[PDB]
Design a binder for these strands. Structure first.
Ligand SMILES: [Mg+2]
Ligand SMILES: [Mg+2]
Ligand SMILES: [Mg+2]
Ligand SMILES: [Mg+2]
Ligand SMILES: [Mg+2]
Ligand SMILES: [Mg+2]
Ligand SMILES: [Mg+2]
Ligand SMILES: [Mg+2]
Ligand SMILES: [Mg+2]
Ligand SMILES: [Mg+2]
Ligand SMILES: [Mg+2]
Ligand SMILES: [Zn+2]
Lengths: 72, 118, 134, 174, 76, 47
RNA sequence: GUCAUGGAGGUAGAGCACUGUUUGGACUAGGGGCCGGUUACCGAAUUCAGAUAAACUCCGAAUGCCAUGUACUUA
RNA sequence: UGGGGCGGUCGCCUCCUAAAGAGUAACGGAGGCGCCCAAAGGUUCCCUCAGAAUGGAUGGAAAUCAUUCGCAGAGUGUAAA
RNA sequence: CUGGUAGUUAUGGCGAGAAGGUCACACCCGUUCCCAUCCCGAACACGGUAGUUAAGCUUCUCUGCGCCAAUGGUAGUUGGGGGCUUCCCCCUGCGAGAGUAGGUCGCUGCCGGG
């Protein structure tokens, strides 16, 4: 941890777009959102697409929704 | 991954400093052993291989420690007095393969402040 | 023709062949062999001539081992050349054979064939030979 | 961070039960990881290395260590002196936070993370992932990423043999 | 005709003093390339690996470990 | 690669001679060498 | 000069532990074809047995050489 | 100068010949030199090479990374010891 | 008994197996302070001991690898003498290398705690 030279880094909690899965993590992006989960150590909010919260191995707008709404 | 061997790699470093530092009858060698909790000081001459003085945290008395960094300075005060009892005045400092930064360092100034010349 | 693929030095001393053979004086692979009684240089052209004569008599039967190899080279000068001005160009390859060295070995044939195929080969070499068994 | 809340709490007792270890010190650890990319095409261009090292730093959070060449090779118009690739060797809390996003949001970003990939083991108990697409991590700038080179992710563990090495990553999620 | 014919000048290396012989300080005991023999007690090494005596005494060619050798000078 | 001389900066007498590469060291080399006349260490600059 | 003691030094011999040269087996690692073999489009490496060297050495004499002696003889 | 001429050589360094101290010739057998480095010098502190096997992406037989074996099979500005 | 620190050509090393101990020595926990990472408290340095003898370490067993090593014989050879001289033979003194019997899982000194 040599001072100054290293780039910025700060833990951030992510949420899945499919389920709003609270997922404590770390990143280097503020994402313009901050929540107060686990008060006393505030964490920013950075949303993310499909992840381990609802991963198949582990449809909302565009893709099929246009396909189903058009053809039904 | 193979776990690192802390003491064995030090023996390689201690053999490097021993190529130029040796103890004789007139000027013995002052050696230092540092562990995770204890620091040991010893005075040796290599012409015949005997110990002239020794002091450490395991001494008979004088128990007073703080951060085990000035405890070495307490050790250095005792070894300097014990070594100077028999007339030893000039010695050479053997690092023991360590650095010269903390506990090993602060041991040295304790002897220099007392009746010992490095 | 048995020749080394490459050599470190083109030119070479001639050496000497005094004393009994260093090693290989016992037949190991085959059952019969030619033992040299005298010592002399043996070229690769004499090895080939002795190899064909001994192989042909068996009608390509059995197995044949060659226990020597021409490592050493030798040079020569043309006719009409005075002495001096360097060393001659290499010409051939020899194998200094000391006394007692086994040169060829034979297996896979009856005794009468073995005792006869060896003597046809022994007439192509400049050494006095002998036939020995295991 | 939560991996500490998930490894020490329940993964540690699971290994002892499944393997019958004599003491607790035999439960395998995670020692170090490396991120080696390889930019050997930069032997002629001095602008490719600037972005890739900067991109890797944002992905991990530590300064990349610009490597060099060891031997001179004729057929690649390459010699001694120029940099070839870079690596980052993180350790500590960053060890699990990097894996925290790698096994949660980075893997689904691939076209198909469901590929088992159980043959990538070194044979002593270390797993070396080889994700080459520079889009799995949701931190790298997609538009700003000019080129696309390949990467390596190496997991080294104190697991003596493969079965307990594979077993650990299964409980950690893989 | 023929290349070659060139050679250097012999440098007269080797031992210059005998075992058990009294030597004055500063006298050369061994000339060499590299370190065929290591310096010992009261013996230094020169810029080009020559071993010389630092004080008067008797030369002793002794043996270091299994694959090494040294020379020392012991005052009488 | 040429041969150069070093000149004292107080006495002005040329005490030392060295060599340097004129393509890699186009400047005038300065070194701190012992000056016999003043019996003290003195900066020396190439003439 | 001999005797006793101590050394430095790799020749003769020998050996394959390195470097070249080299014989017969085992093993055909291989990667693309043919129909797992053929590696017949190869011996690349390891192993067994057997050789070879002025510019090879894991070894290594007899002699000769340098010293010490207060030994005996001799100029 | 194995007659002279033609050809080749003429100073310095390393190896073999050189016969186990040093020295030792031939128009004998092999190679280099007429420089370079302001750090490739001094000192203090620190650590260890080539190669192979496996795991992998651009990148294949070899580019970079990870583990294991590894007495030097590397390196030592340049010729050899 | 244990922790340091030296001498001795590995007969001392390597490999394999078992036991032991937080009295020492260790692994260990974190980086506020000192110091450090071509990055990373991995190491160097720093403050303590939640836990463990897995490792290190210390003991005990081996001949598997390695290392040491005779006796006899042979090669070679100083001196003397003969042949039919690519070389060979005899007498006296010296005398290897390879192979083998055999040996080895070390032996000694000082100091501090028990
Ligand atoms: Mg010098
Ligand atoms: Mg010089
Ligand atoms: Mg030995
Ligand atoms: Mg003698
Ligand atoms: Mg010979
Ligand atoms: Mg001689
Ligand atoms: Mg000589
Ligand atoms: Mg020339
Ligand atoms: Mg250098
Ligand atoms: Mg004998
Ligand atoms: Mg013997
Ligand atoms: Zn001046």
């Amino acid at each position: 941890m040599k001072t100054g030279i290293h780039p910025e880094y700060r833990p951030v909690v992510f949420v899945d777009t499919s389920t709003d899965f609270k997922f404590l993590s770390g990143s280097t992006k503020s994402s313009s959102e901050t929540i107060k989960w686990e008060d006393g150590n505030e964490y920013p909010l950075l949303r993310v697409e499909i992840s381990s919260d609802s991963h198949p191995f582990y449809a909302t707008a565009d893709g099929r929704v246009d396909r189903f709404n058009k053809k039904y | 991954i193979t776990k690192i061997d802390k003491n064995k790699v030090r023996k390689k470093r201690h053999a490097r400093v021993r190529s130029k530092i040796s103890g004789t009858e007139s000027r013995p060698r002052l050696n230092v052993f540092r562990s995770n909790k204890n620091i040991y000081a010893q005075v040796i001459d290599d012409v015949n291989g005997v110990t002239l003085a020794s002091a450490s945290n395991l001494d008979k008395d004088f128990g007073s420690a703080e951060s085990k960094v000035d405890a070495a300075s307490k050790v250095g005060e005792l070894v300097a007095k014990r070594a100077s009892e028999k007339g030893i005045t000039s010695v050479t400092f053997d690092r023991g393969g360590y650095l010269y930064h903390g506990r090993v360092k602060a041991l040295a100034e304790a002897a220099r402040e007392n009746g010992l010349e490095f | 023709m048995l020749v080394p693929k490459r050599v470190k030095y083109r030119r070479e001393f001639r050496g000497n062949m005094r004393g009994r053979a260093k090693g290989g004086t016992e037949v190991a692979f085959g059952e019969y062999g030619l033992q040299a009684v005298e010592a002399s240089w043996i070229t690769n052209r004499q090895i080939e001539a002795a190899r064909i004569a001994m192989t042909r008599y068996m009608k390509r039967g059995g197995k044949v081992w060659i226990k020597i190899f021409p490592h050493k080279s030798y040079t020569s000068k043309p006719i009409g050349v005075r002495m001096g001005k360097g060393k001659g160009a290499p010409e051939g390859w020899v194998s200094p054979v000391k006394r007692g060295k086994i040169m060829f070995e034979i297996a896979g044939v009856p005794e009468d064939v073995a005792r006869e195929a060896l003597r046809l080969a022994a007439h192509k070499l400049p050494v006095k030979t002998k036939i020995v068994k295991r | 961070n939560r991996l500490k809340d998930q490894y020490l709490k329940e993964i540690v007792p699971a290994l002892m039960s499944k393997f019958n270890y004599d003491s607790v010190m035999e439960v395998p650890k995670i020692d170090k990881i490396v991120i080696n990319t390889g930019v050997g095409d930069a032997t002629a261009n001095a602008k490719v290395l600037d972005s890739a090292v900067e991109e890797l730093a944002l992905i991990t959070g530590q300064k990349p260590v610009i490597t060099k060449a060891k031997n001179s090779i004729a057929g690649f118009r390459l010699r001694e002196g120029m940099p070839i690739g870079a690596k980052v060797t993180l350790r500590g809390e960053r060890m699990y936070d990097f894996l925290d996003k790698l096994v949660t949001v980075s893997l689904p970003r691939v076209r198909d993370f469901r590929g088992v990939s159980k043959k990538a083991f070194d044979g002593r108990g270390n797993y070396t992932l080889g994700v080459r697409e520079q889009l799995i991590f949701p931190e790298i700038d997609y538009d700003q990423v000019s080129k696309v080179r390949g990467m390596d992710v190496v997991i080294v563990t104190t697991a003596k043999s493969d079965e307990e090495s594979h077993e650990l990553l299964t409980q950690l999620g893989m | 005709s023929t290349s070659n014919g060139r050679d250097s000048e012999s440098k007269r290396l080797g031992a210059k003093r005998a075992d058990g012989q009294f030597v004055t300080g500063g006298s050369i005991l061994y000339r060499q390339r590299g370190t065929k023999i290591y310096p010992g007690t009261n013996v230094g090494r020169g810029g080009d690996d020559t071993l010389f005596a630092k004080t008067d005494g008797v030369v002793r060619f002794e043996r270091m470990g299994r694959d090494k050798k040294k020379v020392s000078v012991y005052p009488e | 690669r040429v041969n150069i001389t070093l000149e004292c900066t107080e006495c002005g007498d040329r005490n030392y001679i060295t060599t340097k590469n004129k393509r890699e060291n186009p400047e005038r080399i300065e070194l701190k060498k012992y000056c016999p006349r003043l019996r003290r260490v003195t900066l020396h600059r190439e003439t």
